[PDB]
């Protein structure tokens, strides 16, 4: 990718490392792909600049149908990381707009897709730390994509909050919170608390309540993921199998 092949159109948002621009990339066969162009502030530390690149290289290599796609990298300053722009935007906002139309079938589908992404991450012992509907993009009405790697106290396992310990097991906790968000049509977890109060409530043994439209079987699954003991939590491979079963059941009920 040469820089000329990309045209910047407007500001998209601010990212951790620097501004993100909305653009269009014209590929070799002449097609036009909508892109998000991530940049790195000129004031950044060498450690920051390296991290930006090293995260980019991970996104480049994942190539998974439920993780956001990287189009290309322009290393030459100003460094651009060119990501696919998805039309429907963030899953959280998407759920909010379409709460009247979306049925449980589709909500379980999105959960399943994210679970599969995480099973792949699990397989390379890569810890994500940002499984939330704000960081999931809607590519199509029946296809969601986990965004980039990761504080989100209301989403975090006890061991993450207390100690900043992050493992695949803490990701499982967080994935369940994410499923709770999906079945709740984009509600913030523990929206009734201050961040300070969360670990307190968690320590007591209190959990997020079952969303109205969440099937009991799925809530039971969430409850296992929120076991205080990270060793007792299901693995993502097991969860894919469970969610596959629930999905198929909900599909047949729907038809």
Swiss-Prot record:
PTM info: Phosphorylated on tyrosine residues in response to various stimuli that elevate the intracellular calcium concentration; this activation is indirect and may be mediated by production of reactive oxygen species (ROS). Autophosphorylation occurs in trans, i.e. one subunit of the dimeric receptor phosphorylates tyrosine residues on the other subunit.
Annotated catalytic residues: 130 (proton acceptor)
Ranges for domain Protein kinase: 6-247
Subcellular location: Cytoplasm; Cytoplasm, Perinuclear region; Cell membrane; Cell junction, Focal adhesion
Tissues in which the UniProt entry reports expression: Most abundant in the brain, with highest levels in amygdala and hippocampus. Low levels in kidney (at protein level). Also expressed in spleen and lymphocytes.
Residues binding ATP, per UniProt: 12-20, 38, 84-90
Assigned protein family: Belongs to the protein kinase superfamily. Tyr protein kinase family. FAK subfamily.
Record's miscellaneous remark: Promotes bone resorption, and thus PTK2B/PYK2 inhibitors might be used to treat osteoporosis.
Subunit structure as annotated in this protein's UniProt entry: Homodimer, or homooligomer. Interacts with SIRPA and SH2D3C. Interacts with ARHGAP10. Interacts with DLG4. Interacts with KCNA2. Interacts with NPHP1, ASAP1, ASAP2, ARHGAP26, SKAP2 and TGFB1I1. Forms a signaling complex with EPHA1, LCK and phosphatidylinositol 3-kinase; upon activation by EFNA1. Interacts with GRB2 (via SH2 domain). Interacts with P53/TP53 and MDM2. Interacts with MYLK. Interacts with BCAR1. Interacts with PDPK1. Interacts (hypophosphorylated) with PXN. Interacts with RB1CC1.
Function, as annotated: Non-receptor protein-tyrosine kinase that regulates reorganization of the actin cytoskeleton, cell polarization, cell migration, adhesion, spreading and bone remodeling. Plays a role in the regulation of the humoral immune response, and is required for normal levels of marginal B-cells in the spleen and normal migration of splenic B-cells. Required for normal macrophage polarization and migration towards sites of inflammation. Regulates cytoskeleton rearrangement and cell spreading in T-cells, and contributes to the regulation of T-cell responses.
Disease / disorder: Aberrant PTK2B/PYK2 expression may play a role in cancer cell proliferation, migration and invasion, in tumor formation and metastasis. Elevated PTK2B/PYK2 expression is seen in gliomas, hepatocellular carcinoma, lung cancer and breast cancer.
Protein name, UniProt field: Protein-tyrosine kinase 2-beta
Organism this protein belongs to: Homo sapiens
Biological classification of the source: Eukaryota, Metazoa, Chordata, Craniata, Vertebrata
Gene this chain is encoded by: PTK2B
Residues of the full protein shown: 420 to 691 of 1009
